[PDB]
Structure formats: C-alpha cells, structure tokens
Design a protein around this ligand. Sequence first.
Ligand SMILES: CCCCCCc1nc(Cn2cnc3ccc(Cl)cc3c2=O)cs1
Ligand SMILES: CCCCCCc1nc(Cn2cnc3ccc(Cl)cc3c2=O)cs1
Lengths: 203, 203
Amino acid sequence: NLRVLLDTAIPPSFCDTVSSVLLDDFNMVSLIRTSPADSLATIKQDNAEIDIAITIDEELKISRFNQCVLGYTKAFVVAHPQHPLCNASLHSIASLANYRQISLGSRSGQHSNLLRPVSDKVLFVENFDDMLRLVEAGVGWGIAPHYFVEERLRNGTLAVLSELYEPGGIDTKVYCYYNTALESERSFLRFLESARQRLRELG
Amino acid sequence: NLRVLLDTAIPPSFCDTVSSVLLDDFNMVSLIRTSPADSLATIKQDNAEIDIAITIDEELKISRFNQCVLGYTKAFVVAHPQHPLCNASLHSIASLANYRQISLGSRSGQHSNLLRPVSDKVLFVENFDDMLRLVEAGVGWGIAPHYFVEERLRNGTLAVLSELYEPGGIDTKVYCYYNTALESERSFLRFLESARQRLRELG
Ligand SMILES: CCCCCCc1nc(Cn2cnc3ccc(Cl)cc3c2=O)cs1
Ligand SMILES: CCCCCCc1nc(Cn2cnc3ccc(Cl)cc3c2=O)cs1
C-alpha cells in the first residue's frame, strides 16, 4: 500500500495525472487531501506512514524524506470587487499588511515562511472554500489556487490584487516529498518522469 | 540620483534591460553589484541609500521597502564531471548533505533560507568565480546562475546534478525591492512594466 498526500492547493487535473500513473506500477494506492498548512506537519508523524506528498509548502530538509519539483502552479491574491483595494495600485500592494487577511489555519498552530500570513488583521480558516466564502463577503483578502478562483473571477464575484506584485499570477513550485526508500526503486522514477512530463504536456 | 542594486546572480542581459529603461526617465543612475548573500543586508543600511534592488534573495517584509517579481532565472547544481555524484541519480540528490558544498559567504555572517548551505561540509566564497574555480578543481559542488555555467557545461569542464531535483534547471524568482516613495511615481511603474515586458520578450 502506497500512501500519497496531495494538499488542497494542488490542481485536481494534476491530481488525476498522479492517481493515473501510480496505478500503472502499484496495486494499492491511498490518496489523502490536506491543507497546504498541514501537509509537511502530517508526513513528519511516523503514524501517518506517508510515502509521497505533493504540496506547495517548502522545508529545507525533512527526516527520512527527499524533496524535488514536480512542477509549477498559479495563485492569486483575491478580494470582493468593491473591496477598498480594487484599484490594485502599488499603495494597495503595501496596504495588505493593514487590511484583514483570510489565511489558512494549521492544526500544528505553526506556519512556514511561505504560508505564514502577511497582515496583523488575520482570520484563520481550515480550507480554501471557507476562505473564498469570507472573501466573497468582503470580510478580507486571501491567497488561493488559480483553479479555486478561475470560476468566480470571470463571474465578477471576485477581483485580483496580485497582478502588480507578479503579473499572470504567483508562480508556485509543486514539491514532491518522497520516503528515502523509494529513491532507488525504478517504479518511483517512472512516476516522476511520467507525472512531470504529463504536466509539461498539460500547460 | 537613483541608486540601484543588482546581485551577481542577475544575468547581465537582464542588467542591460534595467540599465536601459531607467535612463529613459532618470538623469543620474548608479548601478551596484553585490553577492546575492549581501543584497538584502546592504539595502537595510540607511547609509547605502539604495532605492531599487534586483536580487534572487527573499525576505518577507523589509523596513521602508516593497517587494515584487520582475521575472524568473535558472540555476544549476554543478560539480567536476569526475566528481563521485556524476551518475546524478536519486541517492546523489540526498548525498549532497554529505559532500563538500562551495556556498556564497555573506559579510553579515547570516544567510536566508534560500542561500543557506545544505551540507555540513561547507566552504564559503565571496562570488561565483571563486565558487566555480573550486568546483572545477573537484573541491566540492555548488549552485550557480545559468549564465555563469553555460560556457563550462558545453566545454565539458562541469556537469549538472540538479536535473532529477528540477529538470531544466532550478527556477528562481528575481525580486524587485523598491523604496516605498517610488510606489506612487509613474516613472517607476514605467520601469516595472518595461523591464518585466522586456524579459517576457527575451526568454
Ligand atoms: C502584494 C503582496 C502580495 C504577495 C502575498 C504574499 C505571498 N504569499 C506567497 C506564499 N503563498 C501563500 N499562500 C498560497 C496559497 C495558495 C497557493 Cl497555490 C500558493 C500560495 C503561496 O505561494 C507568495 S506571494
Ligand atoms: C538535489 C538537491 C538540490 C537542491 C539544492 C538546494 C537549493 N537551493 C536553492 C536556493 N538557491 C541557492 N543558491 C542559488 C544560487 C544562484 C541562483 Cl541563480 C539561485 C540559487 C537558489 O535558488 C534552491 S534549490
């Protein structure tokens, strides 16, 4: 049984690219969703017996776990279109520290450099749905995956703030953390090259 | 006088893209090179009176300074081709912690998460030339900009270790740190859009 972790920031397209390739080499494959804020925390528990984690979160070295880059994905800073910072100019790019942020909470209470909130007005939530609910209600701003806000943006329910900070959205590495055992096994190298190559060939 | 900092990790192509655009709006423009390890340390001294810094290094918020992304650039982990880890397989991807790394030193003695060395066998140097000199002599491995190793790689003097960790080289954001004053001034927005757009249109 190969236990596999995908954080909720991972696009579900990318989730099918992984779930597919693994079944080629593997008989039993358990798939687990987690907050990006809970991914690395989870795999560090020996109980969880996680073998592969696919997360946007970064940590320099982990016990018993190697890192590598599967690919890249986009994130946007979003707010209610009527939200004060709608003009999205460079004064708003610094004003975020002053306005309320809807940030992902972590069970572990702690946050990485990456997922730590930027403002002092912070309101924690377990997932991106709770986040964008509160953001649709002008309660604050937040950083969510592209696939979570693709719909609402065209439907005018949400606006972007990030385009001056980083045009085209915020490029974000998807890391593959894998148990050191797998580093030898060909079936794992298969998964890497396949998954990787299948996201190059899927924009 | 507009004081502008570019770390040595910034490609010199990208350096001409900046040096060009600024002269359109600005009369006096001082250009300063620095170790990526010394960039953010430098701009935090009030004496330095730096207005714009272009560096790969990251820090969440700085006093009096806003962040944004000008673009992306590539880095490789390189070694002498005869270096033990030449086979570049996934056991070598974890063995780096055991082999000697030629890491950039910082005057400030401190390092960011990004530029902190990975191994315990570390030998510090001031610049990428000292690094790749020692690396050509099989003394250890190091992470250098693409433009620093483009030559030596084709000329077989150096080999890559990174391609399993991150095929195509290690994607690296180039940040623009700018004094909060500039956030309003149109001439600065000019520089952003121009510099940015000129690196989209220069691969
Ligand atoms: C005008 C300032 C805008 C920059 C906001 C500060 C940033 N934060 C980050 C880390 N970060 C966080 N939350 C995510 C959620 C989802 C996804 Cl897909 C990515 C990410 C992410 O990269 C980068 S950029
Ligand atoms: C098999 C493990 C290989 C990963 C090595 C660990 C990394 N380190 C980093 C940060 N880092 C550092 N030094 C640079 C120098 C020059 C340039 Cl252009 C970039 C960078 C850089 O990103 C990322 S990846």
